[PDB]
Amino acid sequence: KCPTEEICKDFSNLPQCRKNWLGSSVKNFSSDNKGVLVPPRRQSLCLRITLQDFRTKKKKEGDFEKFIYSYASSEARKLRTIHNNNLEKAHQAIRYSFADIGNIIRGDDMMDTPTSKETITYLEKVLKIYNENNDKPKDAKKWWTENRHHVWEAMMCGYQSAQKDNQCTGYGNIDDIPQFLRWFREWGTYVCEESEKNMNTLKAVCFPNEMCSSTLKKYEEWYNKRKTEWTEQSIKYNNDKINYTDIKTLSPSEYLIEKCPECKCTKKNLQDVFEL
Ligand SMILES: [Zn+2]
Numbered sequence: 120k121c122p123t124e125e126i127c128k129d130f131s132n133l134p135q136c137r138k139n140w141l142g143s144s145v146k147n148f149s150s151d152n153k154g155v156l157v158p159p160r161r162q163s164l165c166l167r168i169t170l171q172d173f174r175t176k177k178k179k180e181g182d183f184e185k186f187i188y189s190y191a192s193s194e195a196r197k198l199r200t201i202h203n204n205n206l207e208k209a210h211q212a213i214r215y216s217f218a219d220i221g222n223i224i225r226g227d228d229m230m231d232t233p234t235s236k237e238t239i240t241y242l243e244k245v246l247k248i249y250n251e252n253n254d255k256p257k258d259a260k261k262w263w264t265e266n267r268h269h270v271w272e273a274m275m276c277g278y279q280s281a282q283k284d285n286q287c288t289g290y291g292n293i294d295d296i297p298q299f300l301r302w303f304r305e306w307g308t309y310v311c312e313e314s315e316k317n318m319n320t321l322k323a324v325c326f327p328n329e330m331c332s333s334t335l336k337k338y339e340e341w342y343n344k345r346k347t348e349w350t351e352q353s354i355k356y357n358n359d360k361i362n363y364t365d366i367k368t369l370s371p372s373e374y375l376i377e378k379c380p381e382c383k384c385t386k387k388n389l390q391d392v393f394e395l
Pocket residue numbers: 206207210211288
């Protein structure tokens with residue numbers, strides 16, 4: 120279920136958080152991460168910790184952590200405000216941001232930004248200050264393992280404040296899925312949806328004069344835009360799949376067709392369209 124009303128009170132919103140696929144501003148975009156496209160949701164993710172945030176929040180035990188929780192809660196609220204007429208898109212976007220918050224905290228998020236580079240260093244310094252003589256986490260990896268449940272509660276409390284939803288959810292194991300795969304999947308959820316809709320539209324108009332020709336022209340523009348992105352992301356997918364025993368023999372289309380339950384990608388709307 121949703122978390123108790125008590126737990127939610129302990130979290131707070133941040134007015135900093137208000138409401139395409141980018142092939143740059145990724146670390147090592149020409150080497151390790153060639154082919155990686157950053158989701159628009161990630162580019163817009165509400166979480167920034169500055170040297171100055173570190174200075175203020177470190178002064179009281181637990182405040183820096185709560186500052187993180189607050190951002191996570193605001194990110195969730197924002198996402199449900201964006202996807203207000205669609206519960207499940209909202210849920211999946213929250214999950215994706217939750218996982219992204221994980222990589223940021225753990226210091227291996229792919230975006231080349233100060234927040235992505237610096238958050239781990241600030242968290243770990245604070246944990247040294249307060250936990251160096253007890254049994255509590257002193258590194259960000261253990262912190263995440265021990266506190267990810269709290270982070271998720273803050274997101275659900277956030278999601279509920281958008282429009283008093285009573286339908287919360289768990290996060291599956293989303294945060295354990297390699298980030299490049301999650302981004303590829305999220306691309307998948309947008310594109311396979313476009314693809315199914317665009318096909319129906321094309322068939323309907325062209326195969327029940329100029330409207331057909333006009334429809335096909337737009338269908339082509341959509342196709343070429345996504346085809347470049349498909350091509351880029353397949354480079355990363357194919358380079359890195361060798362390291363995972365259960366996808367190493369799968370093509371990029373097979374990955375999204377067979378191993379992305381949120382995707383709705385099919386042979387007809389993905390494989391037949393994008394892979395010749
Ligand atoms: Zn759901």
